[PDB]
Design a protein around this ligand. Structure first.
Ligand SMILES: [Zn+2]
Ligand SMILES: [Zn+2]
Lengths: 225, 225
């Protein structure tokens, strides 16, 4: 009964598939179109990002994305709370839209506080210079679902963030089942770059687009730092 | 199967009473503590309130609150959408807190667009001069649960609002079962007043407090105009 991005098990049917996926049909779902009608400017706190190197992380093709596990000890501080970075993974094209338009590629940095509350940092990619930290992961990326390899290199997830740290903030959900809500989303405004070849290798390995369609904003607003 | 504000069928157990009440345990519930920690100023549209008189409305004591039915044709316009006023009702002490403080009294004006989406305006009351609309309703409010009477007067809900129309805005839920989420909350900054007699009679008829405890803010911000 595997959920997918297409067909009878695609995103419109996710909540039907499994009693745990009831969230996918509710009112505060992600991703969203970031458009002017419901974004406002606000005085938001500076992003506090405290990342160390991950030594030899595991790289997993779970059939829906390429996921990189992160060793404990790296965190962000939001609203006073520490959220520890657990993993990051990729979507092509982007899940979030900017005024109705996709980016070719999006990375999600998934964090959890000590009670398991989630915060995700989203980073957009535009075509351009090959990203060389991406190139370390791509070189060894398992091509088939359910496969895991150990990267024999150190990597720092900070190198996959823009230097400019202005952001959008809203309250949403995981974008794959079970689609749990109460997720803090922080989407960085400035994209970084990846090569067209890096993006296309990811797409052929994924074999299909792996972005969930944007969801109704409902009674939410998006905040802009 | 019946719900209440205390005991075995009180707020922490609402979700167990009825499968339709699953919302009551999720992550975007109301009311909330309006706290400096997660409140930010923002450029928000002016409230557009277009209320006409309601001729001889029904007043119901449903065991949970005193509810006043409003005649069709009065509405607010938010984000371009017309929400028609259906009813208003009362809580003592208030449901929302400010900086951890209750007000003695709170009114909720419940609106719904043509598809049933909900917008609620909250108004705080402090103890002071008597309110003249409240006086008309209080004169004939049913004292026991399950009773209805028709008011023999016209009233305009606009006279239950403050003159100053600054507000807090956030995405939330109904505060009674089924606790549906996707509710746009608009809480007016400026309290108006009810007399000691008005507050005492309401509390006496309700027999017990009828406010839901405040709920975790989770990943939300409260916007201030
Ligand atoms: Zn993701
Ligand atoms: Zn209410």
């Amino acid at each position: 009964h595997h959920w997918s991005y297409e067909g009878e098990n695609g995103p419109e049917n996710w909540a039907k598939l499994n009693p745990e996926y009831f969230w996918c049909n509710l009112k505060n779902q992600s991703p969203v179109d970031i458009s002017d009608n419901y974004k406002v400017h606000a005085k938001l706190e500076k992003l506090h990002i405290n990342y160390n190197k991950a030594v030899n992380p595991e790289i997993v093709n779970n059939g829906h994305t390429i996921k990189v596990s992160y060793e404990p000890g790296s965190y962000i501080v939001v609203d006073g709370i520490k959220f520890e970075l657990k993993q990051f993974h990729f979507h092509a094209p982007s899940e979030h839209k900017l005024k109705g338009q996709h980016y070719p590629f999006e990375a999600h940095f998934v964090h959890a506080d000590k009670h398991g509350n989630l915060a995700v940092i989203g980073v957009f990619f535009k075509e351009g210079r090959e990203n060389p930290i991406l190139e370390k992961i791509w070189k060894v990326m398992p091509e088939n679902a359910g496969e895991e390899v150990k990267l024999a290199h150190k990597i720092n997830a900070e190198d996959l963030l823009p230097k400019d740290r202005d952001y959008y903030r809203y309250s949403g959900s995981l974008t794959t089942p079970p689609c749990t809500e109460g997720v803090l989303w922080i989407v960085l405004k400035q994209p970084i770059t990846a090569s067209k070849q890096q993006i296309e290798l990811f797409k052929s390995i994924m074999k299909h687009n792996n972005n969930r369609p944007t969801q109704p904003i409902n009674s939410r607003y998006i905040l802009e730092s």
